[PDB]
Design a protein around this ligand. Structure first.
Ligand code: IFW
Ligand code: CA
Ligand code: ZN
Length: 386
């Protein structure tokens, strides 16, 4: 009956299953999706994850028992096979199933690569698990277009995550901005009120530009905005949006930022994972890895957990970082990001090629009773010591 037909369809279209992170990251794929590509997507998720948690400051799921305790990713062979299964929007995330859908494609079928679209949808999984309480489409953050620019603009933004250089702008998004008429560039206020009902969806790109403008030029506002969402503080979020929307000088800065982004189009890259993740790194004793990381990052109270994946094992090293006297959450955030990236580049300078697989982030800003900056710090990497 109808049971055999749904399962037969999934077998025909998605015969392959690839399992990572002790069963919590599952790629269901067509038989023409290469295993090299599967591996790239796994390490891409960790790059996006690391930058997301740095910005949000939380890595604990907001709810207990939700479907996205297991992330499933269904990657069809081609645009045609994706369409039949539902039309072509590139990809889609469904939070109550913890699942997103997209497809492999050639350069002749899309300007966007599979890894770019994957990075976008993975950001929606991160938003929905770690930042936006309740379910997508429900509650006050899903009235009045409150989060429409944010959900889609920060998903385009974090799709540009790198390993050791933070979040970088993406060439194809800048190309959309650059190709637009100057006269038609959205105001800050227009972008913050855009919705899925608009005449076109250029808000994805102007929404990206708001996120990137705040990231580079006003991280205090980005941090406060993320904290209001995290805390389901509608009043604080609305105060921030109104202050951004009503300040002409803020729009001037955002317009200037759009133009600087356009000027970067020619020389911009496409952040995708390095081939260095795919190398055969070889054995390195686990204790040496953990000790070298803890020393380079100046981490105390360190714990580690090991996970099994289809093609390798990984480790997640958690520690506390207590630095110097705090210069405020916002100045601290900037310093912490620079120190952490500098550590990642040092550990990869020379040594085990496995150090080129490391991603790192920090969360849960606080200060001690002596007013020292304090962060929970997290490293993730390949583990070749069974
Ligand atoms: C059901 C549910 O939980 N959704 C959900 C949850 C959390 C965050 C966002 C979510 O969906 C947002 C969305 C976006 N579209 C429009 C259709 N798709 C697209 O246009 C793509 C384009 C992108 C690949 C460039 C998209 O933007 N892909 O994402 N419809 N819901
Ligand atoms: Ca949610
Ligand atoms: Zn999206």
């Amino acid at each position: 009956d109808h049971d055999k037909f749904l399962d037969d369809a999934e077998k025909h279209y998605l015969p392959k299953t690839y399992t990572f992170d002790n069963g919590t990251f599952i790629i269901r794929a067509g038989d023409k999706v290469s295993e090299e590509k599967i591996k790239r997507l796994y390490w891409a998720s960790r790059e996006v994850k690391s930058q997301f948690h740095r910005v949000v400051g939380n890595d604990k799921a907001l709810e207990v028992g939700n479907a996205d305790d297991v992330l499933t990713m269904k990657i069809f062979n081609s645009p045609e096979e994706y369409k039949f299964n539902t039309t072509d929007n590139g990809g889609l995330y469904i939070e109550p199933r913890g699942t997103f859908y997209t497809y492999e494609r050639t350069p002749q079928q899309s300007i966007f690569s599979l890894e770019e679209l994957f990075r976008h949808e993975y950001t929606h999984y991160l938003q929905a698990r770690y930042l936006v309480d309740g379910l997508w489409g429900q509650g006050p953050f899903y009235e009045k277009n409150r989060l429409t620019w944010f959900d889609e603009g920060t998903a385009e933004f974090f799709a540009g995550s790198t390993r050791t250089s933070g979040v970088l702008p993406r060439k194809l998004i800048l190309g959309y901005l650059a190709k637009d008429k100057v006269d038609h560039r959205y105001s800050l206020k227009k972008t913050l009120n855009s919705g899925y009902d608009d005449s076109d969806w250029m808000f994805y790109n102007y929404g990206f530009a708001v996120a990137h403008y705040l990231y580079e030029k006003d991280m205090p506002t980005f941090i406060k905005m993320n904290k209001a969402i995290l805390n389901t503080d509608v009043k604080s979020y609305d105060e921030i949006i109104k202050k951004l929307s009503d300040d002409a000088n803020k729009n001037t800065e955002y317009q200037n930022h759009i133009q600087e982004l356009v000027d970067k189009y020619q020389g911009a890259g496409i952040p995708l994972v390095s081939d260095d993740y795919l190398k055969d790194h070889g054995y390195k004793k686990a204790s040496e890895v953990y000790s070298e990381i803890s020393k380079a990052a100046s981490l105390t109270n360190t714990s580690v957990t090991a996970e099994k994946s289809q093609y390798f094992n990984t480790f997640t090293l958690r520690g506390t970082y207590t630095g110097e006297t705090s210069k405020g959450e916002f100045k601290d955030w900037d310093e912490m990001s620079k120190k952490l990236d500098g550590t990642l580049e040092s550990l990869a300078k020379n040594s085990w090629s496995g150090y080129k697989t490391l991603t790192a982030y920090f969360t849960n800003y606080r200060v001690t009773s002596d007013n020292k900056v304090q962060y929970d710090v997290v490293f993730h990497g390949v583990l070749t010591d069974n």
